[PDB]
Ligand binder design. Structure first.
Ligand SMILES: CCS(=O)(=O)c1ccc(OC)c(-c2cn(C)c(=O)c3ccc(-c4cnn(C)c4)cc23)c1
Length: 125
């Protein structure tokens, strides 16, 4: 009943490092240590949690484990692809859950930190 996780490696896509991609892995993702990170560190395990509607409602799942692996495997060419995956992750949480739910307050806090760090993205090549 869970879907396979998102793809994290694709040798058919070209690979590069950029200052912004480095910042996304080393500053943004790592800043993973937050109090509230665990529910976002791996795909939502609908089987474990007995949430058979989760993947009926969320058709673009995303999570920080996936993002980290993507950054490590040079999956993204453009930083904005990675930023989009973060934003997807947050939006999923907002769609599935209701305001004032603990998990939503967790996501809001994580997203505020995420946004602060993106406002300090370094210069593009
Ligand atoms: C990601 C590791 S996990 O799948 O075991 C896990 C553990 C705890 C979690 O929240 C406290 C979640 C979780 C993550 N996200 C992103 C959600 O949106 C989410 C929504 C609902 C629930 C949940 C747990 N039990 N129930 C009734 C609902 C649980 C979640 C997921």
């Amino acid at each position: 009943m869970n879907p396979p996780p998102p793809e994290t490696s694709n040798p058919n896509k070209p690979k590069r490092q950029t200052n912004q991609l480095q910042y996304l892995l080393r500053v943004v993702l790592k800043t993973w240590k937050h109090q509230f990170a665990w529910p976002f560190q791996q795909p939502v395990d609908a089987v474990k949690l007995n949430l058979p509607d989760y993947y009926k409602i969320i058709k673009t799942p995303m999570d920080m484990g996936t993002i980290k692996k993507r950054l490590e495997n040079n999956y993204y060419w453009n930083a904005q692809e990675c930023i989009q995956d973060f934003n997807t992750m947050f939006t999923n949480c907002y769609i599935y859950n209701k305001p004032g739910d603990d998990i939503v307050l967790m996501a809001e806090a994580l997203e505020k930190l995420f946004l602060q760090k993106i406002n300090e993205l370094p210069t593009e090549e």
